[PDB]
From Swiss-Prot:
Entry PTM: N-glycosylated.
Ig-like V-type domain sequence ranges: 1-91
Subcellular location: Membrane
Subunit structure: Monomer and homodimer.
Residues of the full protein shown: 29 to 316 of 388
Membrane topology field: Single-pass type I membrane protein
Main location: membrane
Disulfide bridge map: 16-76, 117-171, 217-263
Protein name as annotated: Cell adhesion molecule 4
Length: 288
């Protein structure tokens, strides 16, 4: 009895070996033990079954668009009841689709991200594996059979911080219906929110009276801060100051412009403020 295996909707071939062909009538039966081919003639009105070869050595039939209901034993016997012989058992497989990946809720630095991965239909039951940066994560899985096909789900949960924002997680599904070594994969991009940062970088290390200084405020955060605020301790920004987004330009600096300058930004997880100490040296000061 030949073990024959097809992917759902694919093509299988079933062959009856006959030995010293008498010329008598060959009955081929399906898994319900209903006559499917009477000698060379199809006995059931199913256009997916086609006689392919009736030679002195074998009778071969082809099945197109294989369905789960086609599974079971197929038989070949002489109408004279020489023997009830099973000549094949058909098994129909179902490969997983690319898995569906979801997240429980918005992940926030300091908290957890919780992901699920689901394959709704596979046969045999797909195996689900989680990867991050080539390294496998340990998840938790469950599945069940719904008729002849299995639904399988897996979940993983881990702490995140801002370094994980934008990181890629892979869920990978495998089963025997896929060619050896191959996989069905789904990528998921982490979105981790975090409180902002602010840092000032100045266009010069040493500032002299007469200089034009540019301060640049580098900001991070998720969500992205919408607005940079520039300010100064104790008193107002110099009259010539030009605060345009992330840059503060201080032209024509004079001694009285010295002081502490700040840039600040915010998102829904908090504020960040950077401070810059501005020293303005007269032309004769010895600094370096
Ligand atoms: C049952 O069928 C076999 C197979 O041949 C069938 O008939 C062929 C002529 C052709 O129409 C094919 O499509 C069929 O599969 C019969 O064996 C054949 O007998 C015929 C006699 O006309 C001759 O064509 C072939 O040489 C034979 N082929 C083989 C492989 O033996 C067989 O006689 C049929 N049996 C009965 C009881 O009717």
């Amino acid at each position: 009895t030949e073990q024959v295996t097809v992917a759902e909707g694919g093509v299988a071939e079933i062959t009856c070996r006959l030995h010293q062909y008498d010329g008598s009538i060959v009955v081929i039966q399906n898994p319900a033990r209903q006559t499917l081919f009477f000698n060379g003639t199809r006995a059931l009105k199913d256009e997916r079954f086609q006689l392919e070869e009736f030679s002195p050595r074998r009778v071969r039939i082809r099945l197109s668009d294989a369905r789960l209901e086609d599974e079971g034993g197929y038989f070949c016997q002489l109408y004279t009841e020489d023997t009830h012989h099973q000549i094949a058992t058909l098994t129909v497989l179902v490969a997983p689709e690319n898995p569906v990946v979801e997240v429980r809720e918005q992940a926030v630095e300091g908290g957890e991200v919780e992901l699920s991965c689901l394959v709704p239909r596979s046969r045999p039951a797909a195996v689900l594996r989680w990867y991050r940066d080539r390294k496998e994560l340990k998840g938790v899985s469950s599945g069940q059979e719904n008729g002849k096909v299995w639904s399988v789900a897996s979940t993983v949960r881990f702490r995140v911080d801002r370094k994980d924002d934008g990181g890629i997680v892979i869920c990978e599904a495998q089963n025997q219906a896929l060619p050896s070594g191959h996989s069905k994969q789904t990528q998921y991009v982490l979105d981790v929110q975090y409180s902002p940062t602010a840092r000032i970088h100045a266009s010069q290390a040493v500032v002299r009276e007469g200089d034009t200084l540019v301060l640049t405020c580098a900001v991070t955060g998720n969500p992205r801060p919408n607005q940079i605020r520039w300010n100064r301790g104790q008193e107002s920004l110099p009259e010539r100051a030009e605060a345009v987004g992330e840059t503060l330009t201080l032209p024509g600096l004079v001694s009285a412009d010295q002081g502490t300058y700040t840039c600040e930004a915010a998102n829904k997880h908090g504020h960040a403020r950077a401070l810059y100490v501005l020293v303005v040296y007269d032309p004769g000061a010895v600094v370096e």
